[PDB]
Design a binder for this molecule. Sequence first.
Ligand SMILES: *[C@@H]1O[C@H](CO)[C@@H](O[C@@H]2O[C@H](CO)[C@@H](O[C@@H]3O[C@H](CO)[C@@H](O)[C@H](O[C@H]4O[C@H](CO)[C@@H](O)[C@H](O)[C@@H]4O)[C@@H]3O)[C@H](O)[C@H]2NC(C)=O)[C@H](O)[C@H]1NC(C)=O
Ligand SMILES: *[C@@H]1O[C@H](CO)[C@@H](O[C@@H]2O[C@H](CO)[C@@H](O)[C@H](O)[C@H]2NC(C)=O)[C@H](O)[C@H]1NC(C)=O
Ligand SMILES: *[C@@H]1O[C@H](CO)[C@@H](O[C@@H]2O[C@H](CO)[C@@H](O)[C@H](O)[C@H]2NC(C)=O)[C@H](O)[C@H]1NC(C)=O
Ligand SMILES: *[C@@H]1O[C@H](CO)[C@@H](O[C@@H]2O[C@H](CO)[C@@H](O)[C@H](O)[C@H]2NC(C)=O)[C@H](O)[C@H]1NC(C)=O
Ligand SMILES: *[C@@H]1O[C@H](CO)[C@@H](O)[C@H](O[C@@H]2O[C@@H](C)[C@@H](O)[C@@H](O)[C@@H]2O)[C@H]1NC(C)=O
Ligand SMILES: *[C@@H]1O[C@H](CO)[C@@H](O)[C@H](O)[C@H]1NC(C)=O
Ligand SMILES: *[C@@H]1O[C@H](CO)[C@@H](O)[C@H](O)[C@H]1NC(C)=O
Ligand SMILES: [Zn+2]
Ligand SMILES: [Zn+2]
Ligand SMILES: [Zn+2]
Lengths: 323, 298
Amino acid sequence: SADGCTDWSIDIKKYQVLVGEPVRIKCALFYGYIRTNYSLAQSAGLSLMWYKSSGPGDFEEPIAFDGSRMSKEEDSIWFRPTLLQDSGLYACVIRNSTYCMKVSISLTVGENDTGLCYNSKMKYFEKAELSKSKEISCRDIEDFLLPTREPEILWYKECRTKTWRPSIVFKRDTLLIREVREDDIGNYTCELKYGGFVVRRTTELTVTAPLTDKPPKLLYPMESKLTIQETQLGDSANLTCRAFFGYSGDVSPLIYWMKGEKFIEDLDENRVWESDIRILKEHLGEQEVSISLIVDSVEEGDLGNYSCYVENGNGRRHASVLL
Amino acid sequence: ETPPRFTRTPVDQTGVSGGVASFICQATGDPRPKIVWNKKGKKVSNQRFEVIEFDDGSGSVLRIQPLRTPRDEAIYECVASNNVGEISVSTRLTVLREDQIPRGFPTIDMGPQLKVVERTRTATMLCAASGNPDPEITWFKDFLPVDTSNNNGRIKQLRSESIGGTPIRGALQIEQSEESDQGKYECVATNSAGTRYSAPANLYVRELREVRRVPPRFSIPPTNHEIMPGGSVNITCVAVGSPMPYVKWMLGAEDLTPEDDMPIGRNVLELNDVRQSANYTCVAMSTLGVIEAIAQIT
Ligand SMILES: *[C@@H]1O[C@H](CO)[C@@H](O[C@@H]2O[C@H](CO)[C@@H](O[C@@H]3O[C@H](CO)[C@@H](O)[C@H](O[C@H]4O[C@H](CO)[C@@H](O)[C@H](O)[C@@H]4O)[C@@H]3O)[C@H](O)[C@H]2NC(C)=O)[C@H](O)[C@H]1NC(C)=O
Ligand SMILES: *[C@@H]1O[C@H](CO)[C@@H](O[C@@H]2O[C@H](CO)[C@@H](O)[C@H](O)[C@H]2NC(C)=O)[C@H](O)[C@H]1NC(C)=O
Ligand SMILES: *[C@@H]1O[C@H](CO)[C@@H](O[C@@H]2O[C@H](CO)[C@@H](O)[C@H](O)[C@H]2NC(C)=O)[C@H](O)[C@H]1NC(C)=O
Ligand SMILES: *[C@@H]1O[C@H](CO)[C@@H](O[C@@H]2O[C@H](CO)[C@@H](O)[C@H](O)[C@H]2NC(C)=O)[C@H](O)[C@H]1NC(C)=O
Ligand SMILES: *[C@@H]1O[C@H](CO)[C@@H](O)[C@H](O[C@@H]2O[C@@H](C)[C@@H](O)[C@@H](O)[C@@H]2O)[C@H]1NC(C)=O
Ligand SMILES: *[C@@H]1O[C@H](CO)[C@@H](O)[C@H](O)[C@H]1NC(C)=O
Ligand SMILES: *[C@@H]1O[C@H](CO)[C@@H](O)[C@H](O)[C@H]1NC(C)=O
Ligand SMILES: [Zn+2]
Ligand SMILES: [Zn+2]
Ligand SMILES: [Zn+2]
């Protein structure tokens, strides 16, 4: 519109680099919001302007490029090298007399944490399973890669040079582990030299047990046996259900209670209710969890078989107690 | 007096545990019909189920705030009851196993974030989602779906126009923001495989504030000069504003100043070896507006 631009608040992609690193940020409009070449909006008579604000709510101001450190090239801005002052929001705006559209690109430049080779706030995160293969790649270095040239990338584990076992391949820009171990948890720093400036990418690897081919395990109440618990009508009654869950995906476990057939949602009122899935223990992505059913004030109709159900993709198990 | 007539019918859908599930059912009639929701043939009554009626009075929405999958994986019935007749419709609600999800299930790449906006100023919420069949973005405001049948009014919907291989972006833009727009805002990504909900985001509308931004205006417009073929001339064009505008020189429909070094506020066209009459125009553009003023050389 002529009076007001069509603001696309900020873009999903964030640029976060250590200071002293070359980086190129490009207009998100052409790459996600509208279908057009940059040089194709220019031909149609649309102009491309950049603004910069220090914060999300702060005021936007024009930019004047010098061409050497901050150069404006095509639909992108080049920082060679970045400075701490370069952080903020860079608004890409395309407009003509009647049309206007803009989006904000976030750019954060920081120092690495004390004694480390990375900034904990700016890290990639990847998951891997034991006994299986995992490939970690040095991400977001397209502009630094020549297909005819080997990047001569160095890999560090915990910011230190280590001796890598032959089971780890190290081909071009990727590290491949053929069989993952719990020993393999850690921070992987990838370091590449480009034009006299060192660029780095750091990935934190989380390791879990393999995906379970087994159903959950019912600890209490024990299946194939009927445990009895009966109480007075005046006092409260608490029934806990303990189950073990192998790694079936990082997800909330399916453990629930059932009275004969009802789901403890029909006549509950304030009287019966579930325990809210407390998580007792976990390691390598395997969780030992418990959910209790509580009858706060006992009645004659509450008495009966209560069955805990536990389920994953491999199967389910039910066991019941009696009041 | 008329029997109930369905104007909006609920559609079967597949959610995820911990997600939410919303069914819409609108009916018109005189007198206004009353809508009732039945789960497995049973009228719903639960803390987890919230029935929110439109301010139209005609229609209602059934909201399952937490999904448990075995429980509430069922067939639901919307029954519009009139003084003169009853009509009913049915739908299927599948709450998918949070462990197993199809590869192309819609996922929220980025939801809407809480926003605070001045009165009478446009507030825009963004949503980015993706799936193997590229999803469709809808919006729910305070548990009720936001309707923009067409872009008749202030609450317009913005759709990304990607060519593929990118997340899809849908935006809810509120022009001329009334006081009554604040509250919970949820972006829903709908797909043939299933539907997923974004985390809620509160919109807060607050106090009117001072006019920080002023559109661009010419401080020194370009002056006409009449130098004859021998001479050379410098023409100054200065525009100001908040923010300061970019100022470029154009001859007809050709750009004379380069796109990489476009100056801020003040541009001086230097003309040497001029010989013929020209109609040069100074264009000062900003995010607020674009203006142009012409200097003639004879
Ligand atoms: C992120 O953290 C890392 C810390 O590991 C940091 O980069 C590292 O340390 C320094 C940075 O200054 C660099 O290592 C250099 O190695 C060369 C040889 O390759 C040496 O010549 C350098 O030593 C000079 O400085 C000494 C200081 O007293 C002098 O005594 C000496 O004579 C030399 O003049 C220097 O140590 C390199 O960048 C890495 N090195 C390794 C091993 O990782 C980095 O600077 C941090 N990031 C930011 C943005 O600060
Ligand atoms: C400003 O740019 C817009 C977008 O490129 C132009 O709008 C298009 O104009 C023609 C016909 O109006 C068609 O290509 C599209 O239907 C229009 N798209 C939109 C979104 O309006 C507009 O014509 C340009 N204006 C000038 C003066 O160049
Ligand atoms: C990988 O790096 C992170 C920091 O980026 C390390 O996390 C720290 O670990 C210990 C205790 O867990 C403390 O120093 C801090 O509480 C943690 N910081 C953060 C930000 O989590 C982590 O230990 C490193 N991994 C390995 C294997 O050394
Ligand atoms: C009901 O009793 C059970 C068993 O004592 C409680 O479960 C334990 O709660 C304590 C205190 O929160 C924790 O330290 C334990 O780890 C819990 N055990 C398990 C296996 O969950 C439960 O909290 C009680 N619930 C109520 C509110 O009565
Ligand atoms: C246009 O601007 C340039 C740069 O500011 C000036 O150098 C021009 O004026 C100069 O005047 C003569 C006396 C001589 O020094 C020569 O270098 C320039 O022509 C100026 N031209 C105008 C105002 O016509
Ligand atoms: C985008 O630009 C290329 C040239 O760089 C051109 O060949 C192509 O046709 C353009 N895409 C269109 C017009 O869709
Ligand atoms: C300049 O513009 C005016 C009005 O558009 C026109 O009448 C005049 O002929 C133009 N002069 C030249 C030299 O193009
Ligand atoms: Zn261990
Ligand atoms: Zn060990
Ligand atoms: Zn059974």
